[PDB]
Amino acid sequence: ITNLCPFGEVFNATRFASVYAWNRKRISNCVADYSVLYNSASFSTFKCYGVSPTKLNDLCFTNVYADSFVIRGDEVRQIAPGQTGKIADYNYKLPDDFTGCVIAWNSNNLDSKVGGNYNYLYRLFRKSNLKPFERDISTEIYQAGSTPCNGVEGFNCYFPLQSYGFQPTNGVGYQPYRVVVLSFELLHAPATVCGPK
């Protein structure tokens, strides 16, 4: 395979998804140059699990899965196995046995505008925590109280999604970060994604 993995399509997307409606890109039948990623002076975060950034280009996998979205800075720590918080519980959950890398970069200059950018949403309320890689996009009014809501917003009856309102003057923990999770799948099957041999 001379096919080069279309990382560009993911990292340089221009449009990025809200965390609640996170995107997935399947990556198969190409050679992956992880060098392009770990050499970039953009990534404030590069946490790898069951695998090492150095080791990446010398490793072979069945498939790779790139999940991408936007969150607050303070929430970058939650995109990890065995975490809790509004994001890990209600938006995007990694499993305990997760194999892959979590890469994040500050996108204040892109995803912030004066007066606040209210486009990026997250789920604030859910009846229960997400199972790993579950993706909930429903907008059922959430029953906080004892009264049934009947799909009407009001007291104790909240719309489950909230805006971030990223403004450029915020502290980093409240600035937007773009996140890409690379999942490395390893089945008892021939590998389709390898580093430069």
């Epitope: 499993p95 046995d97 199972k131 790993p132 890689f133 089945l187």
Partner: antibody, heavy 120, light 112 residues
């Protein structure tokens, strides 16, 4: 290495209780759905339903909804299949099975099967 | 909804047979997968074809998968005695109830 070990063969009579089991080793037991499949003698495979044992969340097939109960026990890595009152038509081989990965949904991992013979 | 296979097919050693499988729906909104399983008497089914076409390690060549609209197809090329088994079609749809459906089943006879 992922393995599902099921309880031995059961020979019962109509009206009796039955609980058959499936214990999983070699992986994070609470991080994956487990599925039950029924095979009546000489007949095909039927998907009964799944349980997520870290949570005890269940999805039943409309066919088996209300005729069997699927239960979990985090601590002993076991997943159960439960009847109150066995019919003769419950005579079958039962399989617990699991996805290949978090990303590959096809049942690659299977139990050995438990044979349930209901004499009437 | 329900996947239909022929009750049985047969061939002699060396021949190629084709099991069809009909009635597969799908949703682009969620994940999907079409798998083939092989079951020898008194044994648990073995995955032969996953993700429509893809094949596990340890599963011989000879076996291949394909799909046309709503019809999946398995082809055992160059039949061998050990191929005599029941073969099951299977579909997953994350947002269906039920999510998982097995096909009606096909007995393969290798004429001795």
């Amino acid at each position: 290495q992922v393995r599902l070990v099921q309880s031995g063969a059961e020979v019962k009579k109509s009206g009796e209780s039955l609980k058959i089991s499936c214990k999983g080793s070699g992986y994070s037991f609470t991080s994956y759905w487990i599925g039950w499949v029924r095979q009546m003698p000489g007949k095909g495979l039927e998907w009964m339903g799944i349980i997520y044992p870290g949570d005890s969340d269940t999805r039943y097939s409309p066919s088996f909804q209300g005729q069997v109960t699927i239960s979990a026990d985090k601590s002993i890595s076991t997943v159960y299949l439960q009847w109150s009152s066995l019919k003769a038509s419950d005579t079958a081989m039962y399989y617990c099975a699991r996805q290949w990965s978090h990303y590959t949904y096809d049942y690659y991992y299977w139990g050995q099967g438990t044979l349930v013979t209901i004499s009437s | 909804s329900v996947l239909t296979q022929p009750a049985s097919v047969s061939g002699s050693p060396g021949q190629s047979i084709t099991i069809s499988c009909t009635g597969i729906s799908s949703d682009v909104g969620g994940y999907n997968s079409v798998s083939w399983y092989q079951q020898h008497p008194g044994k648990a089914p073995k995955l032969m074809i996953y993700d429509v076409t893809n094949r596990p390690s340890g599963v011989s060549n000879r076996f291949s998968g394909s799909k046309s609209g709503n019809t999946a197809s398995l082809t055992i090329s160059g039949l061998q005695a050990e191929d005599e088994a029941d073969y099951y079609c299977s579909s997953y749809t994350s947002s269906s109830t039920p999510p998982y459906v097995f096909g009606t089943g096909t007995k393969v006879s290798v004429l001795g």
